[PDB]
Structures are given as C-alpha cells and as structure tokens.
Amino acid sequence: TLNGGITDMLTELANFEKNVSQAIHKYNAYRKAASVIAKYPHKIKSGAEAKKLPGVGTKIAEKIDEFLATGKLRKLEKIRQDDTSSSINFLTRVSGIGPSAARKFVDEGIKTLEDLRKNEDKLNHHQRIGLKYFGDFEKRIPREEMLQMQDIVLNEVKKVDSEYIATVCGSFRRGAESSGDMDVLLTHPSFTSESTKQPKLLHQVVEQLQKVHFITDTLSKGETKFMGVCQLPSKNDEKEYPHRRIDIRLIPKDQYYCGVLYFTGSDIFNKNMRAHALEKGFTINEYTIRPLGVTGVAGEPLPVDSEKDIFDYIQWKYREPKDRSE
DNA sequence: CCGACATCGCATCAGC
DNA sequence: GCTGATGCGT
DNA sequence: GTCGG
Ligand SMILES: O=c1ccn([C@H]2C[C@H](O)[C@@H](COP(=O)(O)NP(=O)(O)OP(=O)(O)O)O2)c(=O)[nH]1
Ligand SMILES: [Cl-]
Ligand SMILES: [Cl-]
Ligand SMILES: [Cl-]
Ligand SMILES: [Cl-]
Ligand SMILES: [Mg+2]
Ligand SMILES: [Mg+2]
Ligand code: NA
Ligand code: NA
Incomplete structure (x- = not known):
C-alpha cells in the first residue's frame, strides 16, 4: 500500500495489454513490475529509484514519473475514454x-x-x-469462510474414502486473510505417476460435494482438474452466502510436493521461480523438476521429498508459503 | 541487437 | 472418430 | 516492456 497508486496504474496497463492489445508479454511485464514494486519497502520518490528494481525499465520508470507528478497517467486517461x-x-x-x-x-x-x-x-x-x-x-472470500469451506470439503472427501488427502492451497495456504477462490489439491494412493489403479477418483469427490449441495455448478471437468462453483450453507432466515469459485486438481500422490508448490503460488512467484530454474538448467511443472540437457530436452525427474528440495535444486533459499505472495 | 519471457488441463474448433 | 491448434484460465 | 549475452 506504500506505492498503491503506481502498482494500480501498472496493473491497469497490464490488463489493457492483455485484454485489448492481446499482448501477453507486455501484460506479464507490467505485472512483474507491479509485483516487485509492491514488495519494495520504500515509498517510491521517482522513476529512477524504481528503475533500479528488476522488471522496471525506462518506459515504466518514465510513466512512474508522470504519475508521481500529476497523480495520473495520460495514456490510461485515454484508454478509459475509448x-x-x-x-x-x-x-x-x-x-x-x-x-x-x-x-x-x-x-x-x-x-x-x-x-x-x-x-x-x-x-x-x-x-x-x-x-x-x-x-x-x-x-472476496473472508478467511473465516474459507475455514468453513475447508472443513466441509475435507470432511466430505474423508467420507468418500479415508485415503483421500485434500490440501487447500492458493492464496489461502499463503495465509491470505481473504481469497478470490478456494483451490484444492487432491491425492489418492491409487493414483500415482506409475499407475492409475482406480478410475473416477476426481468424479467421486465432485459427486459427493454436489450431493451435499456444496458444489452448485461446473465450469469444466476432466480426469484431473475440476473447475466450478460452490456455496457455504446458510442458517434459517439467514441470507445466503455468495457463490464461490472452486478449483480441484488431482495429482499423483508421489508428485505431491511439485504439485503443492505449484498450487500454492503465487502465479507470479511460480513464474519467477520457473524462470529462475530454466536459467539454472532445470524445468519445473506441477508434476516434477527435470534438468535441461544440452539440446534443451528435459531429462528424467529428479527425486523430490519436500518443497525445500525443489528450492535447493535451483539454489534458492527456502521460502514459507506466506512469503511467496508476489 | 534480438530472442526469450512458466506451464499445462479442458473446451472447442477445423481438417481429414 | 482422430489430431493439432487455439482460447481460456491456470 | 524488460532482460541478458
Ligand atoms: O497463471 C496461473 C494461475 C495460477 N497459478 C497457480 C498459482 C496460484 O496461486 C494457484 C491458484 O490459482 P488462483 O487463480 O486461484 N490464485 P490464488 O489462489 O493464488 O489467488 P486468489 O486468491 O486470487 O485465488 O495456481 C499458476 O501457476 N499460474
Ligand atoms: Cl506481447
Ligand atoms: Cl491514471
Ligand atoms: Cl513431488
Ligand atoms: Cl513431467
Ligand atoms: Mg485461488
Ligand atoms: Mg483457483
Ligand atoms: Na530495472
Ligand atoms: Na474472462
């Protein structure tokens, strides 16, 4: 909130490039700049000062000066009129x-x-x-409500099969006091990178949650990723809760750490961490961390027994979930 | 310069 | 029906 | 739009 105005400006520009310009790299660039400035512990006094930060170049540094001087940015003033x-x-x-x-x-x-x-x-x-x-x-969803939702999802999943393990990730796992949605990582001993010993593993869970009227709608559904809507139950005479977005990702139990690291985020953090891995010679996705050969071809998965292991492979000191909110 | 910029599941489409 | 590309959200 | 070699 120290540089709230600037980060808003950049996010606005970012959205502009993404939605209107259909320029994904300018969108990511602006977000990166917003992010790094958001964690900057000083109230930006000028563009130059901001340019010192990585992800901030000449163009943004300049916009930043225009903004600090006038309190606004002409480029956006116009975009707003179009x-x-x-x-x-x-x-x-x-x-x-x-x-x-x-x-x-x-x-x-x-x-x-x-x-x-x-x-x-x-x-x-x-x-x-x-x-x-x-x-x-x-x-937004208050953490309080997230806790209520967590309890339901976890208790209903246990009812289906005691061996299911559901972890709530996303911003919730990073300690956010409010979240845009609920993200659930799901694992079952039967489903491993080695084999799928049981079908309908994800279906069975969504089914049970729809059965108890928790899941209300479905945006999309596949074998391992469910994307939909849920809603907490309300008391008698009590006004209903807003409908909430919910994502459920079923990952091979033996690939839990790569999976939880991914789903915990943030997205930008994942972006910077995966970008860093590539520069270190590794490639990371939600299932594994593989080294990159001379040709560029990803090799076999490296052993992973914890989130920290992944960080080590890339020579990055570990960072708790609460500190990955970029 | 100028090439890279993270990664991939599900829905939908065109072509064969 | 299949595959590959694209959109979208991730 | 920014970065690295
Ligand atoms: O582009 C994306 C989007 C999401 N993700 C990962 C990180 C993110 O934290 C996680 C969950 O996605 P959400 O869109 O639900 N974001 P998050 O839960 O972090 O924040 P919010 O409270 O907005 O949902 O998926 C990516 O890796 N790339
Ligand atoms: Cl672009
Ligand atoms: Cl403005
Ligand atoms: Cl793993
Ligand atoms: Cl993989
Ligand atoms: Mg989320
Ligand atoms: Mg989500
Ligand atoms: Na910079
Ligand atoms: Na949209």
Whole structure:
C-alpha cells in the first residue's frame, strides 16, 4: 500500500495489454513490475529509484514519473475514454470470456451486462455460468469462510474414502486473510505417476460435494482438474452466502510436493521461480523438476521429498508459503 | 541487437 | 472418430 | 516492456 497508486496504474496497463492489445508479454511485464514494486519497502520518490528494481525499465520508470507528478497517467486517461477498449475490458471480466471472445462480442454488438443476459444463447457453458454469478465472483472470500469451506470439503472427501488427502492451497495456504477462490489439491494412493489403479477418483469427490449441495455448478471437468462453483450453507432466515469459485486438481500422490508448490503460488512467484530454474538448467511443472540437457530436452525427474528440495535444486533459499505472495 | 519471457488441463474448433 | 491448434484460465 | 549475452 506504500506505492498503491503506481502498482494500480501498472496493473491497469497490464490488463489493457492483455485484454485489448492481446499482448501477453507486455501484460506479464507490467505485472512483474507491479509485483516487485509492491514488495519494495520504500515509498517510491521517482522513476529512477524504481528503475533500479528488476522488471522496471525506462518506459515504466518514465510513466512512474508522470504519475508521481500529476497523480495520473495520460495514456490510461485515454484508454478509459475509448468505448471499444472499455467494452472489451468489461466483457473479459466474465469468467470464460477472454480477449478474443470479448472483441468478438463487441463486433456483434454485445457490449454490456444487459446484452450478455439477453444473448445467453450465444455463450458456451462456462461463459453462461460466469455471467450467472458475475456479481458474486467479484466478491472476496473472508478467511473465516474459507475455514468453513475447508472443513466441509475435507470432511466430505474423508467420507468418500479415508485415503483421500485434500490440501487447500492458493492464496489461502499463503495465509491470505481473504481469497478470490478456494483451490484444492487432491491425492489418492491409487493414483500415482506409475499407475492409475482406480478410475473416477476426481468424479467421486465432485459427486459427493454436489450431493451435499456444496458444489452448485461446473465450469469444466476432466480426469484431473475440476473447475466450478460452490456455496457455504446458510442458517434459517439467514441470507445466503455468495457463490464461490472452486478449483480441484488431482495429482499423483508421489508428485505431491511439485504439485503443492505449484498450487500454492503465487502465479507470479511460480513464474519467477520457473524462470529462475530454466536459467539454472532445470524445468519445473506441477508434476516434477527435470534438468535441461544440452539440446534443451528435459531429462528424467529428479527425486523430490519436500518443497525445500525443489528450492535447493535451483539454489534458492527456502521460502514459507506466506512469503511467496508476489 | 534480438530472442526469450512458466506451464499445462479442458473446451472447442477445423481438417481429414 | 482422430489430431493439432487455439482460447481460456491456470 | 524488460532482460541478458
Ligand atoms: O497463471 C496461473 C494461475 C495460477 N497459478 C497457480 C498459482 C496460484 O496461486 C494457484 C491458484 O490459482 P488462483 O487463480 O486461484 N490464485 P490464488 O489462489 O493464488 O489467488 P486468489 O486468491 O486470487 O485465488 O495456481 C499458476 O501457476 N499460474
Ligand atoms: Cl506481447
Ligand atoms: Cl491514471
Ligand atoms: Cl513431488
Ligand atoms: Cl513431467
Ligand atoms: Mg485461488
Ligand atoms: Mg483457483
Ligand atoms: Na530495472
Ligand atoms: Na474472462
């Protein structure tokens, strides 16, 4: 919050490049800059000072000076006035509508919430559900509620099969006092990198959660990744809780640490840590950490018996989940 | 310069 | 039906 | 948009 104004500006620009410009690298660049400035323990006094930080170059340093001087940025002042950009930026806020679909809908004349509602038949299932819960998905989740949700998910999963292990990751695991959604990592002894001794492992869980009316909708569902909606139960006469987004990822039990590291995030942290691994000669995904050969081909998975092991391979001192929020 | 920039599951599509 | 690309969220 | 070689 020391440099709240600057990081907001950059995030706004980041979203602009992603949604409107469809320039993924400019989007990631801006986010990186916002991130590194967000952890900077001093109130930025000038662009130069910010340029010293990695991820901050000349262009941003300059924007930063313009912003500190005027309290705003002309480039965005205009972006804000452009009807098309405003429309696209908005449509992309619906879960399931991306830069492409967004620009597409605008051409077809669909540019407002009202339009989406009246043209529901022009949306795929995911988008349909995204619009349905457009308001609720805008709401944050208090940790208190996350704890309530955790209890349910963990207790219902135990009911299905005592050998299931569900860990809540994402921002929750990093200690956030509020989260955008609930992310669940799931493991079962039967499902390993070696073999899948039992089918429907993920299905059985989603089924049990829908059975107790916890899961309300499904954005997408596969063999190992479920993407949907849930809602805490309310008491008598009690106003209902907002509908919450929920992601469930089933990972081979023997690849838990690479899996939990990944799902704990943050996304930017994963980005910087994976980028760092490549520079060290390794490649990391949610299943393993493999070395990179002379050709660039990833080799066999290196043994991993803890999150710290992964950090060691890349010569990075361990960092608790609470300190990976970049 | 200029090439890289993290990684991949699920939905949807085009072509054969 | 299959595969490969693309979108999207990850 | 920024970075490294
Ligand atoms: O682009 C992505 C998105 C997510 N992730 C990982 C890290 C992230 O913490 C985790 C869960 O994704 P969410 O989008 O749910 N983010 P998170 O839980 O960190 O924060 P929020 O409270 O917004 O959900 O998945 C990536 O690696 N890359
Ligand atoms: Cl780009
Ligand atoms: Cl501004
Ligand atoms: Cl592992
Ligand atoms: Cl792998
Ligand atoms: Mg999350
Ligand atoms: Mg999530
Ligand atoms: Na810099
Ligand atoms: Na969207």
